[PDB]
Amino acid sequence: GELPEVETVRRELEKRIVGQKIISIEATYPRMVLTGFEQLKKELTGKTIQGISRRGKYLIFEIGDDFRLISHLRMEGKYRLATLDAPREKHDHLTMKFADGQLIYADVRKFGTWELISTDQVLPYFLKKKIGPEPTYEDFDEKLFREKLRKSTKKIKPYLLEQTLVAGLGNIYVDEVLWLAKIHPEKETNQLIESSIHLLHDSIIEILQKAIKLGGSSIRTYSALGSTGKMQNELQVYGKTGEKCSRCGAEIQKIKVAGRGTHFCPVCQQK
DNA sequence: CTCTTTTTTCTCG
DNA sequence: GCGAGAAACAAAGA
Ligand SMILES: [Zn+2]
């Protein structure tokens, strides 16, 4: 999922597993643990979960005083808290067993990843990933944002998806943000004027914070953490091909931009 | 049966 | 370094 969905899962996990001692850890797909499954199992078994943080679309389990399990859900990763006797589901890959339940990770496409690193390696880890600022008024500086946009010829949608200008936007929210800011996805960033960049900046923050408040977008659902989201009922363009724009009434169109499905209003978002 | 569609990171030119 | 295309992988629809 995107930042809102990951934050939703983070909040649920924080509320339910913090303080839990990991009894055992099993894997049917050990290869998704990029730092080595057996090594992770040896290091984390018997340890207690102290907290759950997030950076961009990355989940950060704080286990023991020196361990950090970095988890990325990628396209389809899903977590669920189940009973110890819960039957296995086809795409379940890993499980963290507690005394009165277990945290199961499932991922149909097997894109999701787990990486075990030390507490002091977290900041360097994200610096290496070149992740941009969190989408908040406090961390997302419009001035630097503007300067980077002015220096580039990249198209705005692909550039925003890079996670370098700001962290957290995925295909759904980048489409929603550009529609809200009335900017065409193929617009070269150096062509954006100051007022448009200002609207874009605030729209990125507003859309994501709203999505977080509503528990993310669940255009699917299911017995999993963060599956009761209501943001999907607020989407203005994503997956609305053929429907009418809520502002002007023109039909929402869908095109391909840098290989990604792209939804936009041809009237509100002039090319 | 073929082709298309649905986050991150690499190859190629 | 950059843009285009694709891979990792599974499933469902045209
Ligand atoms: Zn419109």
mmCIF file of C-alpha atoms (C1' of nucleotides) and ligand atoms in Angstrom:
data_model
loop_
_atom_site.group_PDB
_atom_site.id
_atom_site.type_symbol
_atom_site.label_atom_id
_atom_site.label_comp_id
_atom_site.label_asym_id
_atom_site.label_seq_id
_atom_site.Cartn_x
_atom_site.Cartn_y
_atom_site.Cartn_z
ATOM 1 C CA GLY A 1 0.000 0.000 0.000
ATOM 2 C CA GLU A 2 0.853 3.688 0.074
ATOM 3 C CA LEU A 3 1.742 5.792 3.135
ATOM 4 C CA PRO A 4 -1.854 6.091 4.453
ATOM 5 C CA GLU A 5 -2.404 2.321 4.384
ATOM 6 C CA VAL A 6 0.992 1.584 5.930
ATOM 7 C CA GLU A 7 0.360 4.160 8.665
ATOM 8 C CA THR A 8 -3.025 2.523 9.330
ATOM 9 C CA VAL A 9 -1.380 -0.883 9.762
ATOM 10 C CA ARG A 10 1.300 0.724 11.951
ATOM 11 C CA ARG A 11 -1.318 2.177 14.292
ATOM 12 C CA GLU A 12 -3.200 -1.096 14.640
ATOM 13 C CA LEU A 13 0.009 -3.019 15.334
ATOM 14 C CA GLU A 14 1.147 -0.415 17.876
ATOM 15 C CA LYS A 15 -2.159 -0.775 19.685
ATOM 16 C CA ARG A 16 -2.122 -4.580 19.688
ATOM 17 C CA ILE A 17 1.350 -6.176 19.691
ATOM 18 C CA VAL A 18 3.544 -3.742 21.614
ATOM 19 C CA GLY A 19 4.674 -5.545 24.754
ATOM 20 C CA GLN A 20 4.291 -9.007 23.215
ATOM 21 C CA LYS A 21 7.094 -11.534 23.559
ATOM 22 C CA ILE A 22 7.864 -13.369 20.320
ATOM 23 C CA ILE A 23 7.546 -17.074 21.148
ATOM 24 C CA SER A 24 8.587 -18.375 17.742
ATOM 25 C CA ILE A 25 8.888 -17.349 14.098
ATOM 26 C CA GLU A 26 8.165 -19.627 11.137
ATOM 27 C CA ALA A 27 8.427 -19.198 7.381
ATOM 28 C CA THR A 28 7.093 -20.994 4.325
ATOM 29 C CA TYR A 29 8.791 -18.397 2.118
ATOM 30 C CA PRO A 30 12.096 -17.609 3.891
ATOM 31 C CA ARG A 31 13.557 -15.919 0.799
ATOM 32 C CA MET A 32 11.608 -12.694 1.431
ATOM 33 C CA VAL A 33 13.790 -11.993 4.477
ATOM 34 C CA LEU A 34 16.606 -10.219 2.647
ATOM 35 C CA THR A 35 18.981 -10.415 5.616
ATOM 36 C CA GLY A 36 18.535 -14.180 6.073
ATOM 37 C CA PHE A 37 15.585 -15.947 7.701
ATOM 38 C CA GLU A 38 17.416 -18.349 10.013
ATOM 39 C CA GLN A 39 19.494 -15.436 11.247
ATOM 40 C CA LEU A 40 16.373 -13.369 11.926
ATOM 41 C CA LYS A 41 14.668 -16.293 13.662
ATOM 42 C CA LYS A 42 17.703 -16.818 15.898
ATOM 43 C CA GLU A 43 17.999 -13.130 16.804
ATOM 44 C CA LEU A 44 14.334 -12.278 17.428
ATOM 45 C CA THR A 45 12.871 -15.363 19.106
ATOM 46 C CA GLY A 46 12.226 -14.609 22.771
ATOM 47 C CA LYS A 47 12.459 -10.849 22.230
ATOM 48 C CA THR A 48 9.713 -8.339 23.034
ATOM 49 C CA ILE A 49 8.137 -5.834 20.641
ATOM 50 C CA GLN A 50 8.778 -2.342 22.008
ATOM 51 C CA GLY A 51 7.075 -0.325 19.282
ATOM 52 C CA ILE A 52 6.221 0.153 15.608
ATOM 53 C CA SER A 53 7.403 3.120 13.541
ATOM 54 C CA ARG A 54 7.125 4.088 9.876
ATOM 55 C CA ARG A 55 9.233 5.977 7.346
ATOM 56 C CA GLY A 56 7.625 6.576 3.973
ATOM 57 C CA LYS A 57 5.922 3.308 2.976
ATOM 58 C CA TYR A 58 8.254 1.318 5.257
ATOM 59 C CA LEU A 59 7.101 -0.333 8.485
ATOM 60 C CA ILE A 60 9.690 -0.468 11.279
ATOM 61 C CA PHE A 61 9.239 -3.026 14.067
ATOM 62 C CA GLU A 62 11.255 -2.088 17.158
ATOM 63 C CA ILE A 63 12.145 -5.383 18.830
ATOM 64 C CA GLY A 64 14.426 -5.660 21.825
ATOM 65 C CA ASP A 65 16.491 -2.546 22.445
ATOM 66 C CA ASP A 66 18.802 -2.932 19.450
ATOM 67 C CA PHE A 67 16.789 -4.607 16.672
ATOM 68 C CA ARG A 68 14.730 -3.037 13.909
ATOM 69 C CA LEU A 69 12.739 -5.168 11.474
ATOM 70 C CA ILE A 70 12.103 -3.132 8.318
ATOM 71 C CA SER A 71 9.100 -4.383 6.376
ATOM 72 C CA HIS A 72 7.803 -3.239 3.005
ATOM 73 C CA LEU A 73 4.407 -4.453 1.759
ATOM 74 C CA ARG A 74 5.094 -3.457 -1.850
ATOM 75 C CA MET A 75 1.992 -4.101 -3.998
ATOM 76 C CA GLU A 76 -0.091 -6.704 -2.133
ATOM 77 C CA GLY A 77 1.462 -7.394 1.263
ATOM 78 C CA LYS A 78 -1.035 -7.865 4.078
ATOM 79 C CA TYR A 79 -0.727 -8.469 7.808
ATOM 80 C CA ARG A 80 -3.333 -10.075 10.036
ATOM 81 C CA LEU A 81 -3.527 -11.029 13.692
ATOM 82 C CA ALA A 82 -4.913 -14.543 14.104
ATOM 83 C CA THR A 83 -5.486 -17.292 16.649
ATOM 84 C CA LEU A 84 -2.688 -19.803 17.160
ATOM 85 C CA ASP A 85 -4.872 -22.520 15.630
ATOM 86 C CA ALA A 86 -5.795 -20.458 12.562
ATOM 87 C CA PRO A 87 -5.612 -22.506 9.348
ATOM 88 C CA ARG A 88 -2.936 -21.694 6.784
ATOM 89 C CA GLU A 89 -3.979 -19.595 3.800
ATOM 90 C CA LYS A 90 -2.397 -20.088 0.373
ATOM 91 C CA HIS A 91 -0.296 -16.929 0.287
ATOM 92 C CA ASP A 92 0.812 -16.745 3.934
ATOM 93 C CA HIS A 93 4.621 -16.557 4.035
ATOM 94 C CA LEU A 94 5.755 -15.657 7.552
ATOM 95 C CA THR A 95 4.391 -15.740 11.068
ATOM 96 C CA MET A 96 5.450 -14.217 14.351
ATOM 97 C CA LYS A 97 3.872 -16.314 17.102
ATOM 98 C CA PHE A 98 2.937 -14.858 20.474
ATOM 99 C CA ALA A 99 1.440 -16.516 23.556
ATOM 100 C CA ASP A 100 -2.177 -15.718 22.638
ATOM 101 C CA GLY A 101 -2.071 -15.193 18.886
ATOM 102 C CA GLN A 102 0.125 -14.715 15.841
ATOM 103 C CA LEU A 103 0.994 -12.014 13.310
ATOM 104 C CA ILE A 104 0.871 -13.464 9.791
ATOM 105 C CA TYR A 105 2.315 -11.856 6.659
ATOM 106 C CA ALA A 106 0.740 -12.765 3.317
ATOM 107 C CA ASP A 107 1.666 -11.514 -0.149
ATOM 108 C CA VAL A 108 0.226 -13.006 -3.333
ATOM 109 C CA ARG A 109 2.907 -11.554 -5.611
ATOM 110 C CA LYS A 110 5.769 -12.225 -3.174
ATOM 111 C CA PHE A 111 7.150 -8.687 -3.610
ATOM 112 C CA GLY A 112 7.161 -7.760 0.076
ATOM 113 C CA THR A 113 10.414 -7.759 2.036
ATOM 114 C CA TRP A 114 11.791 -8.088 5.570
ATOM 115 C CA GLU A 115 15.214 -6.814 6.658
ATOM 116 C CA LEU A 116 16.709 -7.065 10.127
ATOM 117 C CA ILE A 117 19.114 -4.272 11.048
ATOM 118 C CA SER A 118 20.361 -2.551 14.198
ATOM 119 C CA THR A 119 18.916 0.564 15.780
ATOM 120 C CA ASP A 120 21.830 2.774 14.714
ATOM 121 C CA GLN A 121 21.631 1.501 11.125
ATOM 122 C CA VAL A 122 18.074 2.768 10.529
ATOM 123 C CA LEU A 123 18.863 6.386 9.662
ATOM 124 C CA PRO A 124 21.728 5.323 7.338
ATOM 125 C CA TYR A 125 19.417 2.732 5.749
ATOM 126 C CA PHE A 126 16.934 5.386 4.672
ATOM 127 C CA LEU A 127 19.639 7.857 3.693
ATOM 128 C CA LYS A 128 20.932 5.167 1.321
ATOM 129 C CA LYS A 129 17.391 4.715 -0.058
ATOM 130 C CA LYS A 130 17.323 8.474 -0.747
ATOM 131 C CA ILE A 131 13.820 8.715 0.737
ATOM 132 C CA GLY A 132 12.493 12.275 0.801
ATOM 133 C CA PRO A 133 10.708 14.111 3.663
ATOM 134 C CA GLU A 134 7.560 12.882 5.395
ATOM 135 C CA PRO A 135 4.386 14.593 4.066
ATOM 136 C CA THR A 136 3.834 16.992 6.976
ATOM 137 C CA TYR A 137 3.984 20.766 7.275
ATOM 138 C CA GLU A 138 6.861 20.296 9.704
ATOM 139 C CA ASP A 139 9.066 18.098 7.488
ATOM 140 C CA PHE A 140 7.984 18.898 3.911
ATOM 141 C CA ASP A 141 9.712 22.204 3.089
ATOM 142 C CA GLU A 142 8.031 23.919 0.140
ATOM 143 C CA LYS A 143 11.135 25.974 -0.674
ATOM 144 C CA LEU A 144 13.385 22.983 -1.365
ATOM 145 C CA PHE A 145 10.452 21.277 -3.094
ATOM 146 C CA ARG A 146 10.120 24.270 -5.423
ATOM 147 C CA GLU A 147 13.833 24.402 -6.203
ATOM 148 C CA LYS A 148 13.977 20.735 -7.160
ATOM 149 C CA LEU A 149 10.935 21.079 -9.410
ATOM 150 C CA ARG A 150 12.426 24.148 -11.095
ATOM 151 C CA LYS A 151 15.664 22.309 -11.909
ATOM 152 C CA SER A 152 14.009 19.296 -13.547
ATOM 153 C CA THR A 153 12.491 18.396 -16.913
ATOM 154 C CA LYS A 154 10.942 15.204 -15.531
ATOM 155 C CA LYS A 155 7.179 14.763 -15.738
ATOM 156 C CA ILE A 156 5.491 15.552 -12.428
ATOM 157 C CA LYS A 157 3.732 12.214 -11.836
ATOM 158 C CA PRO A 158 6.837 10.028 -12.334
ATOM 159 C CA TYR A 159 8.960 12.449 -10.307
ATOM 160 C CA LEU A 160 6.515 12.397 -7.372
ATOM 161 C CA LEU A 161 6.435 8.590 -7.494
ATOM 162 C CA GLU A 162 10.220 8.511 -6.969
ATOM 163 C CA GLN A 163 9.804 9.122 -3.197
ATOM 164 C CA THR A 164 12.644 11.667 -3.418
ATOM 165 C CA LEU A 165 10.678 14.955 -3.433
ATOM 166 C CA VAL A 166 8.444 13.696 -0.629
ATOM 167 C CA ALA A 167 7.785 10.219 0.745
ATOM 168 C CA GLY A 168 4.571 8.231 0.647
ATOM 169 C CA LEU A 169 2.815 8.816 -2.677
ATOM 170 C CA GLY A 170 1.805 5.799 -4.727
ATOM 171 C CA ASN A 171 -0.351 5.443 -7.833
ATOM 172 C CA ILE A 172 -3.648 6.160 -6.090
ATOM 173 C CA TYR A 173 -2.682 9.268 -4.145
ATOM 174 C CA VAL A 174 -0.441 10.750 -6.828
ATOM 175 C CA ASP A 175 -3.482 10.707 -9.150
ATOM 176 C CA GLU A 176 -5.732 12.167 -6.444
ATOM 177 C CA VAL A 177 -3.172 14.857 -5.554
ATOM 178 C CA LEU A 178 -2.608 16.010 -9.120
ATOM 179 C CA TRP A 179 -6.374 16.237 -9.697
ATOM 180 C CA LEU A 180 -6.805 18.248 -6.506
ATOM 181 C CA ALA A 181 -3.975 20.590 -7.521
ATOM 182 C CA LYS A 182 -5.269 20.798 -11.116
ATOM 183 C CA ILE A 183 -1.980 19.645 -12.659
ATOM 184 C CA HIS A 184 -1.684 17.296 -15.649
ATOM 185 C CA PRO A 185 0.447 14.199 -14.858
ATOM 186 C CA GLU A 186 2.706 14.713 -17.884
ATOM 187 C CA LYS A 187 3.540 18.325 -17.046
ATOM 188 C CA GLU A 188 7.307 18.930 -16.953
ATOM 189 C CA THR A 189 8.072 20.181 -13.443
ATOM 190 C CA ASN A 190 10.134 23.179 -14.580
ATOM 191 C CA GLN A 191 6.956 24.529 -16.175
ATOM 192 C CA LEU A 192 5.064 24.738 -12.878
ATOM 193 C CA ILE A 193 4.616 28.281 -11.558
ATOM 194 C CA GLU A 194 4.987 29.178 -7.872
ATOM 195 C CA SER A 195 1.253 29.262 -7.104
ATOM 196 C CA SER A 196 0.738 25.815 -8.639
ATOM 197 C CA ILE A 197 3.701 24.414 -6.699
ATOM 198 C CA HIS A 198 2.222 25.888 -3.535
ATOM 199 C CA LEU A 199 -1.163 24.265 -4.195
ATOM 200 C CA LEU A 200 0.554 20.976 -5.024
ATOM 201 C CA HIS A 201 2.601 21.106 -1.815
ATOM 202 C CA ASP A 202 -0.450 21.672 0.394
ATOM 203 C CA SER A 203 -2.539 19.143 -1.543
ATOM 204 C CA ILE A 204 0.042 16.387 -1.009
ATOM 205 C CA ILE A 205 -0.086 17.016 2.746
ATOM 206 C CA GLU A 206 -3.876 17.387 2.888
ATOM 207 C CA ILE A 207 -4.730 14.303 0.822
ATOM 208 C CA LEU A 208 -2.395 12.000 2.736
ATOM 209 C CA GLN A 209 -3.429 13.285 6.161
ATOM 210 C CA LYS A 210 -7.078 12.870 5.162
ATOM 211 C CA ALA A 211 -6.392 9.340 3.915
ATOM 212 C CA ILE A 212 -4.704 8.521 7.231
ATOM 213 C CA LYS A 213 -7.655 9.900 9.175
ATOM 214 C CA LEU A 214 -10.005 7.654 7.175
ATOM 215 C CA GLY A 215 -7.928 4.506 7.653
ATOM 216 C CA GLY A 216 -6.591 4.368 4.112
ATOM 217 C CA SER A 217 -8.157 3.098 0.901
ATOM 218 C CA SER A 218 -9.494 -0.454 0.880
ATOM 219 C CA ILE A 219 -10.744 -1.103 -2.645
ATOM 220 C CA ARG A 220 -10.778 -4.731 -1.571
ATOM 221 C CA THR A 221 -11.046 -5.503 2.128
ATOM 222 C CA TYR A 222 -10.686 -8.780 3.987
ATOM 223 C CA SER A 223 -9.675 -10.227 7.328
ATOM 224 C CA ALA A 224 -6.469 -8.212 7.641
ATOM 225 C CA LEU A 225 -5.102 -5.174 9.463
ATOM 226 C CA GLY A 226 -6.096 -1.846 7.934
ATOM 227 C CA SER A 227 -8.905 -3.344 5.848
ATOM 228 C CA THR A 228 -11.675 -1.140 7.256
ATOM 229 C CA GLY A 229 -10.529 2.015 5.472
ATOM 230 C CA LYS A 230 -13.029 4.529 4.098
ATOM 231 C CA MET A 231 -10.796 6.709 1.919
ATOM 232 C CA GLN A 232 -11.801 4.749 -1.188
ATOM 233 C CA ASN A 233 -15.201 6.444 -0.899
ATOM 234 C CA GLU A 234 -13.449 9.807 -1.254
ATOM 235 C CA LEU A 235 -11.442 9.096 -4.408
ATOM 236 C CA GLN A 236 -12.099 11.638 -7.152
ATOM 237 C CA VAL A 237 -10.258 10.091 -10.095
ATOM 238 C CA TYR A 238 -8.381 6.874 -9.352
ATOM 239 C CA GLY A 239 -10.322 4.017 -10.933
ATOM 240 C CA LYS A 240 -13.063 6.457 -11.973
ATOM 241 C CA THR A 241 -12.493 6.117 -15.717
ATOM 242 C CA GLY A 242 -15.637 7.104 -17.605
ATOM 243 C CA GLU A 243 -17.264 8.736 -14.592
ATOM 244 C CA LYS A 244 -17.908 12.483 -14.279
ATOM 245 C CA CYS A 245 -15.477 14.867 -12.586
ATOM 246 C CA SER A 246 -17.041 16.237 -9.393
ATOM 247 C CA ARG A 247 -15.848 19.767 -10.193
ATOM 248 C CA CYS A 248 -16.582 20.393 -13.865
ATOM 249 C CA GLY A 249 -18.519 17.349 -15.024
ATOM 250 C CA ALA A 250 -16.167 16.137 -17.758
ATOM 251 C CA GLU A 251 -15.498 12.396 -18.030
ATOM 252 C CA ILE A 252 -12.452 11.127 -16.182
ATOM 253 C CA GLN A 253 -9.962 9.656 -18.649
ATOM 254 C CA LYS A 254 -7.267 7.021 -18.164
ATOM 255 C CA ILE A 255 -3.914 6.969 -19.942
ATOM 256 C CA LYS A 256 -0.468 5.429 -19.484
ATOM 257 C CA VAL A 257 2.335 7.566 -18.081
ATOM 258 C CA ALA A 258 5.792 6.054 -17.607
ATOM 259 C CA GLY A 259 4.150 2.635 -17.514
ATOM 260 C CA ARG A 260 1.560 3.461 -14.856
ATOM 261 C CA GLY A 261 -2.222 3.626 -15.137
ATOM 262 C CA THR A 262 -3.121 7.308 -14.856
ATOM 263 C CA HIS A 263 -6.535 8.844 -14.152
ATOM 264 C CA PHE A 264 -7.284 12.536 -14.707
ATOM 265 C CA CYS A 265 -9.866 15.163 -15.721
ATOM 266 C CA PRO A 266 -8.914 16.662 -19.144
ATOM 267 C CA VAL A 267 -10.652 19.930 -18.234
ATOM 268 C CA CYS A 268 -9.379 20.530 -14.696
ATOM 269 C CA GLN A 269 -5.892 19.263 -15.559
ATOM 270 C CA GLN A 270 -4.847 21.103 -18.730
ATOM 271 C CA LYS A 271 -1.925 19.516 -20.564
ATOM 272 C "C1'" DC B 1 -3.777 -19.978 -25.156
ATOM 273 C "C1'" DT B 2 -2.149 -14.633 -25.645
ATOM 274 C "C1'" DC B 3 -2.014 -10.048 -23.858
ATOM 275 C "C1'" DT B 4 -2.986 -6.649 -20.231
ATOM 276 C "C1'" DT B 5 -3.410 -4.863 -15.588
ATOM 277 C "C1'" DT B 6 -2.244 -4.291 -10.602
ATOM 278 C "C1'" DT B 7 6.393 -0.876 -5.520
ATOM 279 C "C1'" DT B 8 10.995 -0.763 -6.047
ATOM 280 C "C1'" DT B 9 15.184 -1.225 -8.670
ATOM 281 C "C1'" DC B 10 18.040 -2.795 -12.345
ATOM 282 C "C1'" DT B 11 19.632 -3.212 -17.469
ATOM 283 C "C1'" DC B 12 20.257 -1.151 -21.808
ATOM 284 C "C1'" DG B 13 21.694 2.414 -25.104
ATOM 285 C "C1'" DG C 1 23.274 10.428 -14.890
ATOM 286 C "C1'" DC C 2 18.590 9.811 -17.871
ATOM 287 C "C1'" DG C 3 14.268 7.669 -20.196
ATOM 288 C "C1'" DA C 4 12.154 3.374 -21.617
ATOM 289 C "C1'" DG C 5 11.096 -1.080 -20.632
ATOM 290 C "C1'" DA C 6 11.116 -4.784 -17.798
ATOM 291 C "C1'" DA C 7 11.728 -8.022 -13.883
ATOM 292 C "C1'" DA C 8 10.308 -10.164 -9.247
ATOM 293 C "C1'" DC C 9 5.378 -12.987 -9.145
ATOM 294 C "C1'" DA C 10 0.307 -14.348 -9.058
ATOM 295 C "C1'" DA C 11 -4.269 -14.063 -10.567
ATOM 296 C "C1'" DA C 12 -8.159 -12.493 -13.085
ATOM 297 C "C1'" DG C 13 -10.412 -10.351 -17.174
ATOM 298 C "C1'" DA C 14 -10.677 -9.409 -22.293
HETATM 299 ZN ZN ZN D 1 -12.881 18.400 -14.009
#
